[PDB]
């Protein structure tokens, strides 16, 4: 079972001996520091961490002894604070004496604002606030996935609106293909759930169970998929039988959308000759609700999309929509699922617009770009101590390195408020107590071992909506 005493950076085991004597409070905060610009971030994922790792009885006699034995060997010395952990076990039945206040999940907040704060509720546990930094800072990942996915939704919305005049289908425009490309099963669920804040199409099944267990949705599931081929199900037929594979697959899934990877040997031949001529009669008979979705999967992503569209536009009837953009028939669509990240997504939709193709014709799949090619440094996610009480006196604490002004941290007790113009401001040095800015938007979400406020996944999705959708 998970042991929170073994879930921190090793150096944090020694910090209880390093804080100033007579310190009764350590208060810390998380922000996406100010430095695609990523001007605003979606706050998402803390509730998972609170429930899975922090709530309830998280200390036991056995976990304390386990940690003591490991740290004796790992440091080659006795430095582990057995007394302080045993105090939590005896005093609070192993429940953490910590209070966490957070902006509501799904909220979209400009960079450089407090998103959550952490402090100890018992003076003996001044060391506990930053013990749990390592666990809590991992919220950078769902925040960053949700934010990067939302920024891709903004690009798709802009170009869909310009080329088609509406946003129909926007939710299914970016599909999660990243289960194989992430570092672990646990990451797959967390990252897939973060993408589902913005979209409804996913093949990363792990995200469904996470949302069900930790957030919840009114609908039975938060994300959906369609039948689709992979190279094994095409190439297993033999190279001379690609047409037989395509025919078998489309026939098998005649009444539902079906995606068919078309680049096993020659994507351009497959489009022009196999789909275009040999099997055309099985495509033009398809329903609007069950289109054939052609999937290239190699080559330069923009050049390949444009050439596939040109081929299909010569072999199938093409209409011009009311915005002047070309539109394939409703039984035929394309999905580009190779090489897609926020930068290439932008390149593809702009190149399509230039060649007068509607964004209605295309959807995207993204794997490593969506869930793996992201780091804590993208949004400068950081956790720092801003306030301590020593000898009964509160002092404002901060770092301000000489070589990097971007690393300067906030001072004192913090609160988050709406400005007069409707923007956001973080008040420092306890100035929120003056009440000149209205109510603090941070709410207590965890106190003394209990999750005190929770959000459904439906609420999170509403909070994370685009302005354009609004």
Ligand X SMILES: NC(=O)c1cccnc1
**Residues comprising the binding site for beta-nicotinamide D-ribonucleotide?**
203, 295-297, 337-338, 368, 376
Instruction: Indicate whether 68 belongs to the interface with a second copy (CB under 8 A).
Output: no
Contact residue for a second copy among 39, 277, 320, 404 (CB under 8 A): 404
Preceding residues of all breaks in the chain (C to N beyond 2.5 angstroms)? 35
Instruction: Indicate whether 288 belongs to the interface with a second copy (CB under 8 A).
Output: no
Length of the chain: 470
Please state the φ and ψ torsions of residue 389, each to the nearest 5 degrees.
-115, 120
Within 10 A of 117 (CB to CB), how many other CB atoms are there?
Answer: 23
Contact residue for Cl ion among 20, 39, 56, 61 (CB under 5 A): 61
Please report, as residue ranges, which positions from 228 to 247 form the binding site for a second copy (by CB under 8 A). 228-233, 235-239, 241, 244-245
d(CA 3, CA 20): 28
Instruction: Indicate whether 259 belongs to the interface with ligand X (CB under 6 A).
Output: yes
Contact string (CB under 8 A) for a second copy, positions 241-280, x = contact: x--xx--xx--xx--x--x---xxxxxxx-----------
Instruction: Indicate whether 439 belongs to the interface with a second copy (CB under 8 A).
Output: no
CB contact at 8 A, 399 and 384 = yes
The binder of 337, among Cl ion, a second copy, ligand X, none, by C-beta within 5 to 8 A per type, is: ligand X
Number of residues that bind a second copy (CB under 8 A): 115
Within 10 A of 287 (CB to CB), how many other CB atoms are there?
Answer: 12
Kindly indicate which of the ranges 119-127, 157-165, 191-199, 226-234 contains the residues binding Cl ion, using the contact rule CB under 5 A: 226-234
Residue 87 CA: distances (Å) to CA of 108, 449, 451: 39, 15, 21
Tell me which residue has tokens 């020593």: 390
**Closest C-alpha to 207, from 227, 231, 218, 223:** 223
Burial class (CB in 10 A: 0-12, 13-18, 19+), 393: exposed
The binder of 61, among Cl ion, ligand X, a second copy, none, by C-beta within 5 to 8 A per type, is: Cl ion
CB contact at 8 A, 50 and 100 = yes
Where on the phi/psi map is residue 380: left (φ > 0), alpha (ψ -120 to 50), or beta?
A: left
Contact residue for a second copy among 55, 74, 315, 431 (CB under 8 A): 74
Please report, as residue ranges, which positions from 172 to 211 form the binding site for ligand X (by CB under 6 A). 177, 203
Give the nearer residue to ligand X in terms of CB position, either 118 or 293.
293
d(CA 76, CA 54): 28
Please report, as residue ranges, which positions from 131 to 150 form the binding site for Cl ion (by CB under 5 A). none
Instruction: Indicate whether 302 belongs to the interface with a second copy (CB under 8 A).
Output: no
Contact residue for a second copy among 24, 70, 124, 431 (CB under 8 A): 70
CB of 367 to ligand X, least distance (A): 6
Beta strands 319-320 and 326-327 are antiparallel
CB of 377 to a second copy, least distance (A): 6
Give the nearer residue to ligand X in terms of CB position, either 99 or 341.
341
Q: Maximum CA pair distance of the chain?
A: 84
Contact residue for a second copy among 117, 152, 304, 366 (CB under 8 A): 304
The binder of 233, among ligand X, Cl ion, a second copy, none, by C-beta within 5 to 8 A per type, is: a second copy
* DSSP reduced 3-state for 25: strand
């Amino acid at each position: 079972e998970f042991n929170i005493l073994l879930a921190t950076d090793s150096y944090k085991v020694t910090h209880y001996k390093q804080y100033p004597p007579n310190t009764s409070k350590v208060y810390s905060y998380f922000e996406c520091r100010e430095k695609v610009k990523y001007e605003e971030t979606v706050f998402y994922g803390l509730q998972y961490i609170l429930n899975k790792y922090l709530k309830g009885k998280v200390v036991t006699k056995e976990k304390i002894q386990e940690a003591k034995d490991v740290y004796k060997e790992h440091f080659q010395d006795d430095v582990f604070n057995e007394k302080g952990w045993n105090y939590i076990l005896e005093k609070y039945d192993g429940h953490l004496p910590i209070e966490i206040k957070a902006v509501p999940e799904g909220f979209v907040i400009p960079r450089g604002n407090v998103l959550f704060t952490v402090e100890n509720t018992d003076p003996e546990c001044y060391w506990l606030t930053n013990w749990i930094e390592t666990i809590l800072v991992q919220s950078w990942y769902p925040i960053t996935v949700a934010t990067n996915s939302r920024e891709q939704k903004k690009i798709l919305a802009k170009y869909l609106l310009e080329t088609s005049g509406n946003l129909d289908g926007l939710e299914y425009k970016l599909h999660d293909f990243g289960y194989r490309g992430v570092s672990s099963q646990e990451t797959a669920g967390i990252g897939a759930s973060a993408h589902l804040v913005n979209f409804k199409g996913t093949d990363t099944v792990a995200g469904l169970a996470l949302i069900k267990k930790y957030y919840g949705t009114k609908d039975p599931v938060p994300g959906y998929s369609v039948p689709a081929a992979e190279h094994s199900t095409i190439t297993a037929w033999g190279k001379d039988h690609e047409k037989d594979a395509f025919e078998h697959i489309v026939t098998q899934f005649s009444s539902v959308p079906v995606s068919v990877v078309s680049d096993s040997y020659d994507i351009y031949n497959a489009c022009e000759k196999i789909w275009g001529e040999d099997l055309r009669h099985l495509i033009v008979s398809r329903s609007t609700q069950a289109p054939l979705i052609i999937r290239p999967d190699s080559g330069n992503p923009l050049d390949t999309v444009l050439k596939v569209l040109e081929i299909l536009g010569k072999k199938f009837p093409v209409t011009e929509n009311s915005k002047g953009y070309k539109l394939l028939p409703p039984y035929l669509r394309v999905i580009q699922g190779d090489g897609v990240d926020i930068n290439t997504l932008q390149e593809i939709v702009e190149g399509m617009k230039q060649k007068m193709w509607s964004i209605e014709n295309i959807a995207f799949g993204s794997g490593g770009g969506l869930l793996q090619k992201l780091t804590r440094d993208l949004l400068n996610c950081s956790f720092k101590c801003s306030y301590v009480v020593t000898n009964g006196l509160g002092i404002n604490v901060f770092k301000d390195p000489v070589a990097d002004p971007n690393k300067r941290s906030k001072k004192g007790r913090l609160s988050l408020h709406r400005t007069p113009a409707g923007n956001f401001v973080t008040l420092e040095e306890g100035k929120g107590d003056l009440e000149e800015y209205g109510q603090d938007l941070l709410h207590t979400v965890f106190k003394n071992g209990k999750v005190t406020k929770s959000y459904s996944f439906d609420e999170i999705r509403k909070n994370a909506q685009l302005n354009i959708e609004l």
